[PDB]
Amino acid sequence: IVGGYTCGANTVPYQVSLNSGYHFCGGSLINSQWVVSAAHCYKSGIQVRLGEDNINVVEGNEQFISASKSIVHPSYNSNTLNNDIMLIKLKSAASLNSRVASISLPTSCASAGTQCLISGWGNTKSSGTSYPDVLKCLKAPILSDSSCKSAYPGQITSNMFCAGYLEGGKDSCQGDSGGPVVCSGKLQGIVSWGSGCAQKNKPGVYTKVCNYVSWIKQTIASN
Ligand SMILES: Nc1cc(CNC(=O)[C@@H]2CCCN2C(=O)[C@H](N)Cc2ccccc2)ccn1
Numbered sequence: 001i002v003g004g005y006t007c008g009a010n011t012v013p014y015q016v017s018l019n020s021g022y023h024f025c026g027g028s029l030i031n032s033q034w035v036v037s038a039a040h041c042y043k044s045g046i047q048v049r050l051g052e053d054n055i056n057v058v059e060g061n062e063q064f065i066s067a068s069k070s071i072v073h074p075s076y077n078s079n080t081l082n083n084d085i086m087l088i089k090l091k092s093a094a095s096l097n098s099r100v101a102s103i104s105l106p107t108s109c110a111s112a113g114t115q116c117l118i119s120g121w122g123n124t125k126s127s128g129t130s131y132p133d134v135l136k137c138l139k140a141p142i143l144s145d146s147s148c149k150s151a152y153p154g155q156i157t158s159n160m161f162c163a164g165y166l167e168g169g170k171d172s173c174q175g176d177s178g179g180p181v182v183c184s185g186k187l188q189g190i191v192s193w194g195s196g197c198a199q200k201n202k203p204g205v206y207t208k209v210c211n212y213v214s215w216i217k218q219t220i221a222s223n
């Protein structure tokens, strides 16, 4: 997260870190057994880390649970990032508490202008590299479809939305991939892609979760 702020420990209790020897992506806990992340975060050997603030120190509220299965969306296209969503099943159910909590799925799509919360442990620099240990947060509005398409001509599908600031300076970034965009208490977006981080006229692009609720519900009912 570039241009954001320190969230405060466990104030984003649905945020997960995906670990394969090191943090590589975020995700969102949607019930005690399932995490939503980005399809571009797929890899084998995932451990889900819940209850994290400092990802380099055991602070006492974590739960570390291996994934038993990952399900990338059947229509994910890794060239266009259309349908950039993946479900991860936990080998055992998380113990839900004030520091480890699920985030609701949306029942309607969020509106342009709505302010959302984006979070993660990704790079905090727009030029150069610095990775934080504690969770970072950014408040950002959903942008109009026309401004999103003008920023990324020929690249925005109906399964994507832009959020952020056309002036630059505030954005998600590498390492925030797969993490949540929460608006009105619902998971409306997944950190997906952008052209650099926090660059002028290049806001973040996010998977539009409301288009996937039927797939998520049917998949978790059968796996
Ligand atoms: N708001 C954001 C969020 C992010 C997080 N996402 C990434 O870092 C992803 C992971 C793979 C690379 N990438 C990019 O977004 C590439 N720039 C484009 C690209 C995409 C896919 C393959 C190659 C290139 C980055 C930037 N602004």
Ligand SMILES: [Ca+2]
Pocket: 052, 053, 054, 055, 056, 057, 058, 059, 062
């Ligand atoms: Ca920790």
